[PDB]
Paper text:
DExD/H-box RNA helicases, from virus and bacteria to eukaryotes, play important roles in processes including ribosome biogenesis, RNA processing and folding, ribonucleoprotein (RNP) remodeling, RNA nuclear export, the regulation of RNA translation and transcription, and nonsense-mediated RNA decay. The N-terminal domain is commonly referred to as conserved domain-1, or [name]-domain, and the C-terminal domain as conserved domain-2, or helicase domain. Both domains contribute to the binding site for RNA substrates and both contribute to ATP hydrolysis. We used X-ray crystallography to determine the structures of the [name]-domains of DDX2A, [name], DDX5, DDX10, DDX18, DDX20, DDX47, DDX52, and DDX53, as well as the helicase domains of DDX25 and DDX41.
Also known as [name], an isoform of DDX2A. Two of the structures show unique P-loop conformations. The [name] structure features an α-helix 4 that is longer than in other helicases, and leads into an unusually closed P-loop conformation. As a consequence, the ATP binding site is not visible on the surface of the [name] structure. This conformation is most likely induced by a crystal contact in this region.
Residue numbers in the entry: 30 to 137, 151 to 236
Amino acid sequence: EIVDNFDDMNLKESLLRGIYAYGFEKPSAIQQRAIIPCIKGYDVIAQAQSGTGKTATFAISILQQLEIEFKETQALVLAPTRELAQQIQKVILALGDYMGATCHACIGEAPHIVVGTPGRVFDMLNRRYLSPKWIKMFVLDEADEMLSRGFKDQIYEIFQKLNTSIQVVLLSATMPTDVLEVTKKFMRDPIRIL
């Protein structure tokens, strides 16, 4: 399914409000393919380059699925660097600005979303500063870069701390062997968008 406009995606009013306020008009090719299966809760592998359109894809998907009145961390995003983590927080907070979504960057009240590098997130879990109990969505951004930087084993230990029932969304410009190994381990009949 390709849905070529945001109004036909069954998104919440308050979320669409953030989308139009940000300045988006028409969904990009990745947004037209990926938003729907992400919001339906499927595991998703998306081959996508760095960019706002990519970030807004998983931001929208997370935001649509949040229970805003439940003040617990419901989604966890891993990125290769503190700078990328901060960009993601910035995009998420702009898009969620009309729905009361909270988002903290873990880069060295519980927020709805935490985004950070694998090392910092792993530490936060070990120190009980982040509870895995209510995390329903686990997003791995630029997975190729995280794995090339040597984060595989810390990513695996994080995944081990999360509930069995999570949705996993993995985004990567390239799909090397190591990336494909993670999708096979972490995902169940994933949607593939390559």
